[PDB]
Point group: D2
Chain length 220, copies 4
Amino acid sequence: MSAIKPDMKINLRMEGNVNGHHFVIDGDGTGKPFEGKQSMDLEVKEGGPLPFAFDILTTAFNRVFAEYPDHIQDYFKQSFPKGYSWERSLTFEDGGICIARNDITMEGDTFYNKVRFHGVNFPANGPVMQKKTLKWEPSTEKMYVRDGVLTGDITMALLLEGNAHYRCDSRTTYKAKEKGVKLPGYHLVDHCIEILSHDKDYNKVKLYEHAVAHSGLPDN
Amino acid sequence: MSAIKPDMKINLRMEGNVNGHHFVIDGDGTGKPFEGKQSMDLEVKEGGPLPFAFDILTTAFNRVFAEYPDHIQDYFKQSFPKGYSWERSLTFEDGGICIARNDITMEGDTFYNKVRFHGVNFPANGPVMQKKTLKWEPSTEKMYVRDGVLTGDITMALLLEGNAHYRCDSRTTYKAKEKGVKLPGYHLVDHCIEILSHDKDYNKVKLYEHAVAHSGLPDN
Amino acid sequence: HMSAIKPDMKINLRMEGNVNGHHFVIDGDGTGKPFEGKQSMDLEVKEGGPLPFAFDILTTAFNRVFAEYPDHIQDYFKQSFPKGYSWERSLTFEDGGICIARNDITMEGDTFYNKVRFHGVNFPANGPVMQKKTLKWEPSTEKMYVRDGVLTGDITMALLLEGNAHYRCDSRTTYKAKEKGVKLPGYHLVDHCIEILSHDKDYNKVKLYEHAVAHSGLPDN
Amino acid sequence: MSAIKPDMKINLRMEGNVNGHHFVIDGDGTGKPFEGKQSMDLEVKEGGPLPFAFDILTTAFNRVFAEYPDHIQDYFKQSFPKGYSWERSLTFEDGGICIARNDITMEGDTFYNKVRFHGVNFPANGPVMQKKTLKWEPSTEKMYVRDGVLTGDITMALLLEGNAHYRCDSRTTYKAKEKGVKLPGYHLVDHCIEILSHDKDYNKVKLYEHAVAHSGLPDN
Ligand SMILES: O=S([O-])[O-]
Ligand SMILES: O=S([O-])[O-]
Ligand SMILES: O=S([O-])[O-]
Ligand SMILES: O=S([O-])[O-]
């Protein structure tokens, strides 16, 4: 009491537009906030089949699901029950640019996610519009405070078919709903994200993430 | 050929969300497509007073309004009567990122503009959230083709209080609705945009743009 | 004060640099008309020739004194003389190539002297620079403004490539007068066009030309 | 008969120019390649006292010093005895940009390093020219292949006095001298780097780095 339980449910609704293509996607899942693990079943409700790589959406589908050790302030679990919100930009190396936001709330044992995602300027023959991506490689998010706001920057990479990589820089700004939530010091958060399964058109996808916060070398 | 008249009316509808603040803005104006001039009266219908600098929105409020000389293919006038659409990213120097789009159609003597605008990651004490902007400086858009699509990049700058400047890079991708509209060669488009007047909170704004296409030195 | 800049000036230039780990030295001798914003220069690779990279990436490094300034815009560059000024520049190419360059500019009599350095890193082996697939810079427009108390010019640039694709490069130059008391200009634009008029097969010898004109943008330009 | 020995020496010379200020700096160190730990004593031979934050130079003062696990190809240890070279760009958030190069060779138990470092466009009032930096935060370098070349991208941050942070993006390209050195798959390398001690003007500096390669979650 102690808002967050060892096992939580996850309800998510994303709406968005990439390349002028509108879509709506519902998510239903479960996770273990204290182990930093979560899974979700996603369903394209409108806009299917998506004309673009589903992978660009997957980080938009909650840093509550991250294992924080005792020596690092856990801004995210501290933000409940009132919750918090985040904004993000994704800057892909070929000019594709996405913005996204999620307003995260909690009712009982369930997190609710209102997610918006917009992508512009993706080249027609790029790996995104040609759906040539395989997965995100595991990443490390750098967490720091800027102008009063917890900020996470990430150098990300999509593995492509033919074993090339496709670079994307992510900046996320995280804001507790409640006044006064103490900001953490600089720290790192390892991520790995995986589409465990999906149908042909990616109208149905099962997503998994694992995340662990740490202080970097040599204290990790 | 185009059915674009020397004098046209402009109907505009924008919806958007900056920093989590949703808004709706209507525009009604008139322009001279062949003189590359237009003006518009904008009214904030929802979300007023805006908590952010109105200037960030104004380039989203149609390159049909640009004087094109004979020796340069005019992709925009050649796109009608069927019309065209664009997507844009605005990358501000302090991490603020916006995306925008506009679907442009024509019915008789009126252009219709369905515009969307999203902005994320603006710092609380930056010139945008603190409304320290004065105007966009006159600019020059660099037009070229990339992956089969007409693309415009601009080095933009907002004049700020005290005559400092706040930099923003714009990339716009332009796509004619009808197939096989001939793409132009590399060229430049000069722009100047100005808020001619506005009320205290910028719920009401009169906007003007002048744009002229040219080939650069030594010609221009 | 009187600039001591004549309508017809000589240009002496010395570049040294390193791109992709390849060292080079290039000399330049040219002439120009500061008030007309036009200049031409004959360049000769003295060391490291033949260059294994596109000569074009070097050409903007080969002096905003050579820009026609109208009377209503403060001319920081001509006012920097006789003492002179220096600039530093970053070039950020869309495929990861990054160059930095500097020029220290002085004047003796009818001649500008230029000590130029140029370093480029992270150009991919099969990109248009290492493969020498560039044709020219397209005409550009430099945005001039005071940033952190220093006149700065930002530019969206584009190299035409063979196959008529374009290759994007963003430029930022910082310009600093050597002498105190040089008035800073308000925001303005400088149109450029730069052209290799001729070259020998390996670009060991190159004739370069530039035309530049400052203006206030629309609606009065 | 291995080229890499458990305890090795490091001889280094850097020459460079930041904001027009020329400098020469010699380094003499020792390290343990297999444990990814090294220390070096640096001495400014020319250009002291440096007018800029010594911290911008420290990553330029060899990925052979990284603990590589068996399941990740170790490109750097495989590059000896002949050696390898790297080029780097450092893009700071306020427009300061640096490039650096190191040509690394080996004789007996000693690595030799020919290092060059050039920085431009640092603002006079910024934390580099004001010497307001305290340290690099621990980081994670993302290693991947692009156009045949091992490439490392890093989201870096300098902690500043007052506990603000100053962001810098690093790209390094690494090239074995010898033909036929096998490229590794995608992986991460954790770093931490620390000035253990220095005299008042940073004419003398003792530097330490620890680095460890890993596969990220869930392995790590
Ligand atoms: O937790 S990872 O295997 O997507
Ligand atoms: O089109 S300009 O005169 O604001
Ligand atoms: O005057 S320009 O075509 O070098
Ligand atoms: O080199 S590490 O101990 O910050």
